[PDB]
């Protein structure tokens, strides 16, 4: 309907590259141990100071729509890297810039950019195979502290506290971050649980800073049957809201009308309510349901055995937590007010079920239920004197936790951009199908030198000399941009998770090689 | 009522041609195996990268209204080709440009453009007769894989998975495309329903991306009679209001008051409901509704035998699907929660009904019911690392599926624009009625060289030499624009569906020859 | 109340002439067999391509209000000709231009434009008398096919299908046009009826393309008395709400409150309802009511005999149609779901009423009822590959049907503007009263050569030489602008209805001679 502006050829590509270059030049100053921060003006209050790459990327939009298309594409790169890795967004941004630039620099009349994209993706597949080859598994908590220290801009306190947090709880344990009122950071180990079901509707969010629903001292409603009917929720809503306590709803499947009633009470009069789907695809659903009802003090409704209905609800059947956090993909309960004796009875029942099971698949479910009910969670309270320092350190702690989880789950490689420098001979052993595929392979081969060059460039030295010196050294020797020396990267602790590196490379390559294939760009006429 | 700007003669034609040329120049870069992509700015979020011609055509509007008229007419060409064939929109666009240009150039004082249009339509009828003459029936699954590979920009994975899909579900089976969370594509065979009735009111759409109504884990309400009264729908709406699963309504005819109440609940409070007309005409309608109620677990209301009324409705009388998709022209049911024993009993009843029928018209209806209840549905999940790559690959997969359906419907011809090049000697034998019909025949004869020239142009070579060498070669020799050589197009698999080619040519010719009959263009004064 | 701009003398006349000349120059390009089309931009999407003169006229408005007055006056000419003839609007437009121009030219100080207007109307009366003298009745269906072929821009397919439609249904039978989904046109004979009562309130219009009410599978409510009371329509609207079929209300006189209730349900919630007055006056009214009730299956309410009231209405007392079309001046029922045996019994009752009567005035009413029950309805479905093609052919099909009806009603004359050329000696036999009547007679005498000149001018030749060659030839020799030769017009089939020609001439002359009497033009100052 709206009038459109259409551009052709290399002018649209030049404008798109200009937007890509603006956003990636703003992001690339944050890279490494000599990286600097970015101040982002906030419309409501105090401005935000950050070193996190996706926060810099999301904050940038341009009036020029042709530049804004490239800005949005690199934003998609940074957002995908933050979503499936939680770290390495600056690396993905500079890799995407390099692929987009070297792809725009190689488009001619006889060139086929789709075959160039095929070559690019084939070369990235080769490099990810070599990354999986070079990777080694994390076996010592010293490496855990090293990963969390490197990912938190060389903060040894953050790495030590994260290593202690998963020493006390679990390498696959639940570790959370929140604001602290003290100057220094602290770690508290408290009882809690966490399951992988998020909210059902996005209208429940009352905290637009982390897109999550946050209540304190709220009721919790467990049910084996789907909490559906009007006479299933309206007595429940009356009992919950009328008691001066908010309501958390756990049920199997919630789709249709009563959530729209919940939204009508949330948006008009402001009812503090949230609904979460129940985890479990069988008897484990009922088992975890009963475990959370025991830990919270509430009961289970719609069950097969007792047949407790949601019409006749009483206040002494609703569980009480001290805190609940409901995100898009996961929800969690904190400090349930259930009886300690009943919790101990359920823990001993789980032990006696673990003593009579040998199928090696229900045993890990019972062990997960025991780890949920028994050891609790970890909470990092981040110190500082103002909210801007707390927010910047919180971003660093989130990066360090994400990287540490990725290094537990997939392993580690060499840091400082050296693990991409070591994958060049794998591209030197490829045989291209045709010339455009060779162009794509050479594009990826030149792109693999970019993160180390950016790290060294932020350190005030010439990155190409550094990178040449790294390629002429042995396989364990890279650059330490904090110290300014060429060292053994493993024994000095400069290591990266393999998952973060491969996620950044793949998410950069796909979007940037799709951007290279363009010939015509269509934007709207600005009004 | 509004003030108008009126232009006469060749100035209005020149401006209209200018709009046609802008839209078709944006579309023509996408053609062939060396075609490039088009980035379209999206107002909400990330921009859209596409190679599909009708998306580029529909994304372009102009401020100049005289140019916008030609843009809308070529957009109508592309839309009609996408509706009637699902493929070949870029070819229809370049053919429409060629006919519009050659018709605008041929208009003089003594010329009759309506007789020129008559000549155009006569020549296109001749060329479509020759296309139906040259067509060969697809009798190998290798040809299936070749068609789906060519239509998906030379992607052998998409062609292989589509060929395997209709190896599993049948050539006239149903294959669907949806988003995938993995990197690579995969094929899943579910048991599901699909019939050729769409939604009745257009207010039922929730997802505005494909103009379809999509629910998951939804109730299903079937009635042999029309769901007709407020006291028929209000028990059903109170069940879907309380028991909280989306309501899918299968009824004979729905036009009046209760659907307006349904729209009122759709728009004000947001009731997730959809209504679909019943398929079939006669006892086949009742048989299909009984089959659907058996497969979903629900019952049939308003029947002649049992006389189960729509006033007394129970929760255990509604079917439960796992997913429902209702588009404008067809609807679909996924994972009906019916009894397996009841479904098997209905399948054996259908077998025993097939064993006592010999009229050869009810036998194909019974076989269609058997393939509905037994053969199932096919699901293609499209992989990728970002939504833009997934969306562009989904466009290519939809093109390949549409072209494979057209090739099992009407056979195949030569690819690369060669089947239009082979119809020139058919035009070299028509005798024109008069001079203007001769002009129209020559316009079509020059237009028949255009798709091959555009394909060769996008491949970096000069297309007139290519077309001249194809026309001097044998009937089985065309250009391989991917390989840059002259090959056997049947042996190398470069083949097009006949239906796509004739649909594109007819839809281009009609609108372009109607455009070239215009002396006066009336537009609105811009405010 | 608004401030006004007032102009005097020949400047205002020149500006009005300018508007008349703009609209008539846009319309005159469409005239004849070598006429061209006009593209009109539509705000809701695809533009309209047309050759119909009144469609071009109604689409043109000017910003300068002095030109807009003349444009709207020629719009009144074209609209009146389209209303009382259905054809000849381009001829009326060019005649009105000629009279307006030659009247503005002849205005001097001593001239009286009102006696000039009297001369104009006297001369037009003479020419219409000579047209009625030259007219010949249509006796052969070859002339029917010739009229419908000429009126549809010279294709024999529309003429052949229209001639076959009144061979199957009759020359006074009803023939309707709707869009077809096929490429080619086809003729369908359906059983239906048609009376001359339109809608009663204009709020019932749902389809704003032809200002008509369009329902399918609709209830029908017939009453012999006026459907007046609230408790007469609340059971009926309750049944329409409780059964989901649009209510078609047929009653005697409908003026008051319950139609305002119908409008309130039409606009707020959307009740599909329409009310039509009952045709006939007296016993014929109730006879047609009983015929339509026994044809649709419903009953008659408020009757004298059975006394069936509108308070107690049952679902088995409403008729069911398959299609109903309610326009401004007439309504029409298609596919009534009545008993075939009851319809046959009413047919034999009508035959046995015909066999005992000789009054020769209600016998034609009985024959009309028999035709409404037995003769049927022709439906012309228009083919094409796009909606612009379908609309452009549908305008010509409507023009050909209108012309064929006018040629059945009043006969035929020579085509190509020759029947106006043959009326010049009749004007050469008048004796004017004074000199201004002589001026008006000479104005009409010069105007009578304009349609043939415009036809020849659209054919690329000089129209004045053609017209001078026509007047020197015999009375049966005129120009054939398609073939460019002078032929026998009756033998070659180039014929026009007499009614169309006289309607166009009279409607042009009245408005143009009223326009040429103006000394002062008062417009509004634009804001
Ligand atoms: N002392 C060091 N010497 C050399 N390289 C280092 C050193 N410390 C960290 N690095 C490297 O710097 C990179 C970390 O940069 P940074 O954390 O700013 O960006 P990122 O991981 O791409 O993205 P994000 O902004 O999301 O954290 C990693 O490649 C890491 O190996
Ligand atoms: N390797 C090839 N060599 C030559 N011609 C080819 C080759 N592969 C495909 N073609 C031809 O290119 C055309 C396909 O182009 P493309 O799919 O981009 O456009 P389209 O079918 O006109 O429209 P749409 O954009 O809707 O898909 C067909 O005529 C096909 O035969
Ligand atoms: N082959 C022909 N040779 C000469 N005159 C012809 C021929 N065919 C049609 N005509 C004449 O052309 C006129 C028809 O023109 P046209 O139908 O375009 O306009 P119209 O009847 O004035 O109005 P409308 O736009 O409503 O159709 C008639 O006078 C008809 O007799
Ligand atoms: K950073
Ligand atoms: K294309
Ligand atoms: K005309
Ligand atoms: Mg980091
Ligand atoms: Mg294609
Ligand atoms: Mg006409």
Swiss-Prot record, chains A, B, C:
Name used for this protein in its record: 60 kDa heat shock protein, mitochondrial
Q: Which GO terms describe its cellular component?
A: cell surface; clathrin-coated pit; coated vesicle; cytoplasm; cytosol; early endosome; extracellular exosome; extracellular space
Subunit structure, briefly?
Answer: Homoheptamer arranged in a ring structure. The functional units of these chaperonins consist of heptameric rings of the large subunit Hsp60, which function as a back-to-back double ring. Interacts with 2 heptameric Hsp10 rings to form the symmetrical football complex. Interacts with HRAS. Interacts with ATAD3A. Interacts with ETFBKMT and EEF1AKMT3. Interacts with MFHAS1.
Primary place of residence?
mitochondrion
Q: Mind telling me which Gene3D superfamilies this protein's record contains?
A: GroEL (3.50.7.10), GroEL-like equatorial domain (1.10.560.10), TCP-1-like chaperonin intermediate domain (3.30.260.10)
Phosphotyrosine-modified residues are 66
Q: State which disorder the record connects to this protein.
A: Spastic paraplegia 13, autosomal dominant: A form of spastic paraplegia, a neurodegenerative disorder characterized by a slow, gradual, progressive weakness and spasticity of the lower limbs. Rate of progression and the severity of symptoms are quite variable. Initial symptoms may include difficulty with balance, weakness and stiffness in the legs, muscle spasms, and dragging the toes when walking. In some forms of the disorder, bladder symptoms (such as incontinence) may appear, or the weakness and stiffness may spread to other parts of the body. Leukodystrophy, hypomyelinating, 4: A severe autosomal recessive hypomyelinating leukodystrophy. Clinically characterized by infantile-onset rotary nystagmus, progressive spastic paraplegia, neurologic regression, motor impairment, profound intellectual disability. Death usually occurs within the first two decades of life.
Name the Pfam families for this protein.
Answer: Cpn60_TCP1 (PF00118)
Subcellular localization, per the record? Mitochondrion matrix
CDD domains reported for this sequence: GroEL
Keyword terms, alphabetized: Acetylation, ATP-binding, Chaperone, Disease variant, Hereditary spastic paraplegia, Host-virus interaction, Isomerase, Isopeptide bond, Leukodystrophy, Mitochondrion, Neurodegeneration, Nucleotide-binding, Phosphoprotein, Transit peptide, Ubl conjugation
| Any single GO BP term | positive regulation of type II interferon production
Alphabetized GO MF terms: apolipoprotein A-I binding; apolipoprotein binding; ATP binding; ATP hydrolysis activity; ATP-dependent protein folding chaperone; cysteine-type endopeptidase activator activity; DNA replication origin binding; double-stranded RNA binding
| The enzyme's E.C. designation | 5.6.1.7
**Positions of ATP binding:** 51, 87-91, 416, 496
**Similarity field:** Belongs to the chaperonin (HSP60) family.
Per the UniProt record, the source organism is Homo sapiens
